Design an enzyme around this catalytic site. Sequence first.
Site, short mmCIF file in Angstrom:
data_model
loop_
_atom_site.label_atom_id
_atom_site.label_comp_id
_atom_site.label_asym_id
_atom_site.label_seq_id
_atom_site.Cartn_x
_atom_site.Cartn_y
_atom_site.Cartn_z
N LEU B 14 -0.81 -4.90 2.10
CA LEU B 14 0.25 -4.70 1.13
C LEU B 14 0.49 -3.23 0.83
O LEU B 14 -0.42 -2.41 0.96
CB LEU B 14 -0.11 -5.41 -0.19
CG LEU B 14 -0.10 -6.95 -0.24
CD1 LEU B 14 -0.68 -7.42 -1.58
CD2 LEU B 14 1.32 -7.47 -0.06
N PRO B 15 1.73 -2.89 0.44
CA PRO B 15 2.01 -1.49 0.12
C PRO B 15 1.07 -1.20 -1.05
O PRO B 15 0.90 -2.06 -1.92
CB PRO B 15 3.47 -1.53 -0.34
CG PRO B 15 4.04 -2.66 0.43
CD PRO B 15 2.96 -3.71 0.40
N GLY B 16 0.45 -0.03 -1.07
CA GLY B 16 -0.46 0.29 -2.14
C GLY B 16 -1.90 -0.11 -1.91
O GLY B 16 -2.76 0.20 -2.73
N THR B 20 -2.58 3.91 4.51
CA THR B 20 -2.35 5.27 4.99
C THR B 20 -3.48 6.25 4.72
O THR B 20 -3.76 7.10 5.55
CB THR B 20 -1.00 5.81 4.46
OG1 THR B 20 0.05 4.93 4.88
CG2 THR B 20 -0.73 7.20 5.03
N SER B 87 4.25 -4.68 7.70
CA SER B 87 4.45 -5.76 8.65
C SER B 87 3.76 -7.01 8.08
O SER B 87 2.75 -7.48 8.59
CB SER B 87 3.83 -5.35 9.99
OG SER B 87 2.50 -4.84 9.82
#
Lengths: 172, 179
Positions: B14-16, B20, B87
Site C-alpha cells: 500500500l502507498p505509505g 520506496t 500495483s
Amino acid sequence: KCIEKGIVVWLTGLPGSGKTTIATRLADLLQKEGYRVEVLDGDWARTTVSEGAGFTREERLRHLKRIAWIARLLARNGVIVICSFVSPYKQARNMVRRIVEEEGIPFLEIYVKASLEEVIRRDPKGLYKKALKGETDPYEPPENPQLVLDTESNTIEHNVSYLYSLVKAVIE
Amino acid sequence: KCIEKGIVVWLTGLPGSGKTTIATRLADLLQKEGYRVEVLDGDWARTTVSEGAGFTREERLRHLKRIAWIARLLARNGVIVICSFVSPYKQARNMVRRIVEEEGIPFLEIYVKASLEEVIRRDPKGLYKKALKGELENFTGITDPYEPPENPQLVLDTESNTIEHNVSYLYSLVKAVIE
C-alpha cells in the site's frame, strides 16, 4: 566485455531508408566482439513500452522521451544502445539528445539519408496501403549529425562500416 | 562489478507502507558493494517513461507492462532492478512477473506489509493534502482494494519490524539469489 558506460546511437531517417538493417548489422558486429547491445525500434516499442497507439505530435513526443529515458538507463549501465526511429522532427530529436547527454552519455545522431522521391517510387504498394490504413509532416534533417549515411551513393555494407568505425572510435 | 544476468525485485504494498524507503536503502547497499543497480518507482516514472497517463485500470496496466519491459531489458544486461510501484492487483503483478520470467530473469515479489488503517494513521498530514488538492483516485488503498500476493518470495512486516531489520532481511534474499 565490461565497460563502465555505453553510448546511444540514434538512427534517424525516412521510413524505407533502411535504418533497421543498418542498426541490426551494427549490433551483430558489436555483439560478436563481446559488447552488451540493445537495438530499440518502433516495431519493438509498439508491442512493449509504447503499446497504445497515439500519433498526435504530443503522443509521439511522449513516446520519444520515454525511449530516450530507456536508452539513458541502459547506456549508464554499460550498454551500447542502438535506436532506430524515423523521428522526423528536429526539436523532438534535440529533446532526446539532451536527456541522454545530461547523463554524460555519448549521443551519436546518425542521419540515414535517402531521397523522398526514390523511397516512394520504389514502394507504391506501401504508400497505397498506408493511405488505406490511415497513414503534411516534412522530415527535418539534423543540423549537426555525427554522421550522414547516404543510402543511395553507398552500399549498406560500406555504410555499416562507416558507422562501426565511429562507434569504435568512441567506445574503444 | 560484472554479472551476466541481474534480477528484478518487485516491492508491492500500500502507498505509505514504506516500499520506496526499503528500495533505496537496499539499492545503496548493493551499489556500495559495486553492483549495477536501478531503482524504478512511480515518482520517477511519472515524469519520464509514463509521464502522461491517466489512472484508469487499463492505463495503469499499460504502465506496468511498460515497467516490466524496461526492467527485463536492464536485468538481461546484468542490472539488479529494484521496483517500487502501485500495483494492487494480483493479475497485474502476475503479468509483470511473466514478462520478466520469460527472459529467464528471477522475479522476486516482495510483500511490504502494512494495514490500510495503519498507513492512514501514519500520515494524517499527507492524507489531508492529497484530499484538499484533489489528487486522490491515486490513494488506491480505498479506490482499489489491495490484493496481497498469494505466494510472495518474502514478506516484510513494517509494523512488527524496523526498517533496518527489513532492509537486512531483503538483502539476504537478494544476495542468496544473485550468488
